[PDB]
Amino acid sequence: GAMGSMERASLIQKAKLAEQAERYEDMAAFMKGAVEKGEELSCEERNLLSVAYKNVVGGQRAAWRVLSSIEQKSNEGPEVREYREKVETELQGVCDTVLGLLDSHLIKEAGDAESRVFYLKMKGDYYRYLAEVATGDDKKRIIDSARSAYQEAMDISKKEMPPTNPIRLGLALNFSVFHYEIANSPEEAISLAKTTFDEAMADLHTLSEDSYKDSTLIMQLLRDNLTLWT
């Protein structure tokens, strides 16, 4: 499967090398190969998967935004539209690839809260990225798929994880972005970010120095957004 002949351990090692070399397309292909071996992923390996694809899709989203801006300017030749469509299509394929890995079969095999919440968050994230470029007939159903993934992950995280858990915090952060940027629900976005921040603050006293640093890092992002949004 491009990577079907390489050992799982070698794929993981090369993913780590590509990260060091900032070769994120390679890193993604390696981690896709690792996932397709069929074994569950460790916490470190789930983070490698997320890092790889987030960087790949991140460059595509930035390109798409530059081009969409030019295209909107141009209607204030078909080339700008054609090339925005090319980038858009490549973004959608990356998102479809990640969603396919989650659906076949990472989520259904994830029984622990840390793995299951991580993967459901990712599912929400990649539907959100699809939503960012979607325009109609599917735009509503894509939004509803992101919302549903995020909501299931929130319910699990509230039952199973402490309020300072970095996965729980990154989840709540991204759901609040979803509310503000995608769902036209800025009040929900602000409420969630506030409630999330305040409940984590009240749980910080239970953490070690290194866990405190992990949690407060994400809390600051919630605060940065609240400053932007209010």
Binding site: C43, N47, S50, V51, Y53, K54, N55, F118, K121, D125, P166, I167, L169, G170, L171, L173, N174, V177, Y180, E181, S211, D214, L217, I218, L221, D224, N225, L228, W229
Partner: peptide, 10 residues
């Protein structure tokens, strides 16, 4: 413009 989560979460 809104900040989202880092990819890597402990």
């Amino acid at each position: 413009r809104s900040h989202s989560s880092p990819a890597s979460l402990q």
